Design a protein around this ligand. Structure first.
Ligand code: HEM
Ligand SMILES: [Ca+2]
Ligand SMILES: [Ca+2]
Length: 306
């Protein structure tokens, strides 16, 4: 069983070391908090939160970093290396990369203005990476609501609250133009923009992502508060201003009878959202963890111990 007090004796300063690292990095890279939270999400959705995503290539298995959902998208790996080295210095061979990334995600959310809580700990590190599983399990921005629900249920999150609350991770961070081009110019081969995208916002996004323009150009997920972790993400959805298809579908999909009330509840109360986010975050962090003597306490998050 995972427990928040796992390192209270062996490494009481772990959370503070992680926090210090992120604070330092945020000065030169204001996007790092968002990037780190996403790394935890992509770790947990592939064989559970086992730091499998942090492993680099080997001749026996491919890295998840080359998965369609990670390649030229996932970032912040050097920052994780930095905090790992710092923690290893303070507490040698004690904190797993899986737990380190979980704490990093929570601290990132808190630093960006989100809720503060102690995450369950005790996870251990994988002995391999899963590229095929990552390609199959990570959801995509073009997924319909039923597909999004399927993707979450596939890894163990059955609740619509899990989906709606965790999607709130898009209250900050960046998104490449490539992922919304269809919504802006030719959605579902209709030759027209996605009708669920506010027409005023449509104009703005078209200006940032012109047809035949730089597809790697970055756009803010939350037009209200781009770098602050708050419930503004849901207020946007209510106004048809969700950035990607998967965001807006939570409010506009024909299958959103169960998600619409959740979107409204989170937009109406920061407390309601934050409570649900913590609840969902801990549920995601509890996905098929390796515990006890299973797996290892990786010394270098990029490679399995030898
Ligand atoms: C529900 C399905 C989801 C889909 C389809 C999805 C899709 C995406 C896409 C397309 C990007 C842009 C990547 C890029 O342009 O490089 C992204 C970024 C991001 N996502 Fe999600 N996401 C989902 C759920 C989540 C969840 C559950 C979290 C975390 C709790 C999360 C946190 C983030 C953050 C913070 C970023 C910004 C990262 C950065 O700026 O470096 N996402 N997501
Ligand atoms: Ca994983
Ligand atoms: Ca925000």
């Amino acid at each position: 069983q995972l427990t928040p007090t796992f390192y209270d004796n062996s490494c009481p300063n772990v959370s503070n070391i992680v926090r210090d690292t992120i604070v330092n990095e945020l000065r030169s890279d204001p996007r790092i908090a968002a990037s780190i939270l996403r790394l935890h999400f992509h770790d947990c959705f592939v064989n559970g939160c086992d730091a499998s995503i942090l492993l680099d290539n080997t001749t026996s298995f491919r890295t998840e970093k080359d998965a369609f959902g990670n390649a030229n998208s996932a970032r912040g790996f050097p920052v994780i290396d930095r905090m790992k080295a710092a923690v290893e210095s303070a507490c040698p061979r004690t904190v797993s990369c899986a737990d380190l990334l979980t704490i990093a995600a929570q601290q990132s959310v808190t630093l960006a203005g989100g809720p503060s809580w102690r995450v369950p700990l005790g996870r251990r590190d994988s002995l391999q990476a899963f590229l095929d599983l990552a390609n199959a399990n990570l959801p995509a921005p073009f997924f319909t609501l039923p597909q999004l629900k399927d993707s979450f249920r596939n890894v163990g999150l059955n609740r619509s609250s899990d989906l709606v609350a965790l999607s709130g991770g898009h209250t900050f961070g960046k998104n490449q133009c490539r992922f919304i081009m269809d919504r802006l110019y030719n959605f579902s081969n209709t030759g027209l923009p996605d009708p669920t995208l506010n027409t005023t916002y449509l104009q703005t996004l078209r200006g940032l992502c012109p047809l035949n323009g730089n597809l790697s150009a970055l756009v803010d997920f939350d037009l209200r508060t781009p770098t602050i972790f708050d419930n503004k993400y849901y207020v946007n959805l209510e106004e048809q201003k969700g950035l990607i298809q998967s965001d807006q579908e939570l409010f506009s999909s024909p299958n959103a009878t169960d998600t619409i009330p959740l979107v409204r509840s989170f937009a109406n109360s920061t407390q309601t959202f934050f409570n649900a986010f913590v609840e969902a975050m801990d549920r995601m962090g509890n996905i098929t963890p390796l515990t006890g003597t299973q797996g290892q306490i990786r010394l270098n998050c990029r490679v399995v111990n030898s």
